[PDB]
Design a protein around this ligand. Structure first.
Ligand SMILES: CCCCOC(=O)c1ccc(O)cc1
Length: 185
């Protein structure tokens, strides 16, 4: 991820005017929509948290957790740490990122800081559900001037995506003021 850290604007977009900041959400959402499409219920939930982080959840199968035979770490960690720009870019540019995967009866969790895994992906409990959740806190070392998520910028794009990905339910929630929307074509 050092090439991303060196020139963040070249991967994510302008880091001063809010472009890049919002693109971080859109990259995660692209992956969440792919995941939701391969499941039965087909819903994603995008939440703006009061602490300026965003989470994106899907109810798909869960991203793969098994050890990548070449890289020797979980497949999930490979996706997060190896170079759509890819979620690894989001991870590199987040001061914190939390990954939760529900798959094959188990909850799996991992935390990253500035793209660095804090421990290996780990099984933390049991579950009947399936899906993936990524929550990220954008790095305020990278993102300047515009540092807070604008609801309407996210809403506009999710609306466009709902028409293109018809049959996928998209929920948007703002925990700062309780604003919410439901896009479903
Ligand atoms: C089968 C591998 C799919 C790759 O998925 C992702 O990179 C991913 C990232 C963030 C999400 O919220 C969901 C999936």
């Amino acid at each position: 991820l050092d090439a991303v850290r060196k020139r963040p604007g070249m991967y994510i977009g302008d880091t001063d005017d809010g472009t890049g900041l919002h693109h971080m959400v859109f990259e995660v959402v692209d992956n969440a929509i792919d995941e939701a499409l391969a499941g039965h219920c087909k819903e994603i939930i995008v939440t703006i948290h009061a602490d300026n982080s965003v989470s994106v959840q899907d109810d798909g199968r869960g991203i793969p957790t098994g050890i990548h035979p070449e890289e020797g770490v979980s497949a999930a960690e490979v996706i997060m740490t190896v170079l759509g720009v890819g979620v690894s870019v989001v991870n590199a540019l987040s001061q914190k990122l939390e990954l939760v995967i529900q798959r094959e009866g188990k909850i799996h969790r991992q935390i990253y800081e500035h793209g660095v895994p804090q421990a290996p992906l780990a099984v933390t409990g049991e579950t009947e559900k399936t899906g993936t959740m990524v929550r990220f806190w954008p790095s305020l070392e990278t993102f300047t001037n515009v540092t807070e998520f604008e609801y309407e910028i996210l809403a506009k794009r999710l609306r466009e995506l709902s028409f293109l990905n018809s049959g996928v339910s998209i929920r948007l929630r703002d925990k700062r003021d309780g604003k919410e929307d439901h896009f479903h074509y």
